[PDB]
Amino acid sequence: KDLNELQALIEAHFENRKKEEEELVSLKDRIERRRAERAEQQRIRNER
């Protein structure tokens, strides 16, 4: 039962850190969106 509870919590924190990694990936994605939008608006400013 020690092994059972331990593997249970292992898979549990697996899932938790996995959700956190998904959130961080979405963060990186919106981050690259922010990079692209800052790039285009900066470039527009520089064009003018």
Next chain:
Amino acid sequence: SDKLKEAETRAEFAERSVTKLEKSIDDLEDELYAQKLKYKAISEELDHALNDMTSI
């Protein structure tokens, strides 16, 4: 005229600083993305190990 020259020089300095800061923050974001990619890769390898350990 002196005041105008001072202001113009300040503006040029600040603009160059903002350009450098933008490039640096983008580069550091790239580095963080790369390290996150490495962490995710080893995490997926460990998750496969856990999937096999479920049979262990």
